[PDB]
């Protein structure tokens, strides 16, 4: 068999954006196996060893003015630059969620399921309403699921004691639509 | 927030290298190191942007060289195998005979080497399957996705079969209607 030991090395340049390209932070990090050793935080301005393993690198990299100058300006020439290039098809990408309501194959009380799938971006807000009023207790979510294909999904149940005539509404607010999406369950 | 990540890695002694761009956790693209060209996660991206693939090849070379130096100065401290958390789900609420897709989530593992196989009633499936490359995680472990387009039925029973050095034995995640 293959029992040879493995040795991994990762380099990551993270561009963090808040309020568009208003504030931008660049975090350059090195990881040996599972241990981050060195990093360049644009908020810091220079490399910093994260563990003793990285000390040599931080010291050597910080001794290169040209490296530091280019690195310091990367928040503009790299981050803000790439944001401007891909913004149109990433930050603005939008796919409306497919919403459907049905009772769970679980069950006295009746467990309702609000299936919200195939949407992008991931930020979405789903709430349950009984007769037009928010439901706090009894709600249980599966959590936001990222499908790895630029799509997300989630299921949000609502345990209930159904009374003929009641109207349980599942409400979904998402960037893809101006007005919320509603799907009712008629008791 | 909003995060764009340029992630790369190199693994010895498998000599596996990867170079990809990430946006809020979703892959924008990665570079095919053999064909030396850019492969966009979604076809459409390649029409709205471009990228110099050769440049990833320059970085990868540096990455390896760096790996060799680090390996040596850590006294050949090997990576600890961390087994994957495997989950199987469908892309949307399943309905009999209504085309759907099986997603196999292989998450929180390292090193970035894995053998994934789909099974339909104990037999391996090939047609229509697709998979992603290794995706980065804040904890520096990896995630990965395998897909299997399928036609729901009551008889069929599927398994996402995953092998990883972290696993003493093949892990089979079951999924049926």
């Amino acid at each position: 068999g293959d029992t040879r030991p493995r040795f991994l090395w990762q380099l990551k340049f993270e561009c963090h954006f808040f309020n568009g390209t208003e504030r931008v932070r660049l975090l350059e990090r090195c990881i040996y196996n599972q241990e981050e050793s060195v990093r360049f935080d644009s908020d810091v301005g220079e490399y910093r060893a994260v563990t003793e393993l990285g000390r040599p690198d931080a010291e050597y990299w910080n001794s290169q003015k040209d490296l530091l100058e280019q690195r310091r300006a990367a928040v503009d020439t790299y981050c803000r630059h790439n944001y401007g290039v891909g913004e149109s098809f990433t930050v603005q990408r939008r796919v409306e969620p497919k919403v459907t309501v049905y009772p769970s194959k679980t069950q006295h009380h009746n467990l309702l399921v609000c299936s919200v799938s195939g949407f992008y971006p991931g930020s979405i807000e789903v709430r349950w309403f009984r007769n037009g009023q928010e439901e706090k207790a009894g709600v249980v979510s599966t959590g936001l699921i990222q499908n790895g294909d630029w799509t997300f999904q989630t299921l949000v149940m609502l345990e209930t004691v159904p009374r003929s005539g009641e109207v349980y509404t599942c409400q979904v607010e998402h960037p893809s639509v101006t007005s919320p999406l509603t799907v009712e369950w008629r008791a | 927030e909003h995060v764009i990540i340029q992630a790369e890695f190199y693994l010895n002694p498998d000599q596996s290298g990867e170079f990809m761009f990430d946006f809020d956790g979703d892959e924008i693209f990665h570079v095919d190191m053999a064909k030396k060209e850019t492969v966009w996660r979604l076809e459409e991206f390649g029409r709205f942007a471009s990228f110099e693939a050769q440049g990833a090849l320059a970085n990868i070379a540096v990455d390896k060289a760096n790996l060799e130096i680090m390996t040596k100065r850590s006294n050949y401290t090997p990576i600890t195998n961390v087994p994957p958390e495997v989950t199987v789900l469908t892309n949307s609420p399943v309905e009999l005979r209504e085309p759907n897709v099986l997603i196999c989530f292989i998450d929180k593992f390292t090193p970035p080497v894995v053998n994934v196989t789909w099974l339909r009633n104990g037999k391996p499936v090939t047609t229509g399957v697709s998979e992603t490359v290794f995706l980065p995680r804040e904890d520096h472990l990896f995630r990965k996705f395998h897909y299997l387009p399928f036609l729901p039925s009551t008889e069929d029973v599927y398994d996402c079969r995953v092998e990883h050095w972290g696993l003493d034995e093949p892990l089979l995640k079951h999924w049926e209607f």
Partner: peptide, 15 residues
């Protein structure tokens, strides 16, 4: 389309 810029990997100090 528009070009996505790369950041060059930094060589660590030699042995």
């Amino acid at each position: 389309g528009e070009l996505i810029g790369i950041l060059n990997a930094a060589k660590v100090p030699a042995d």
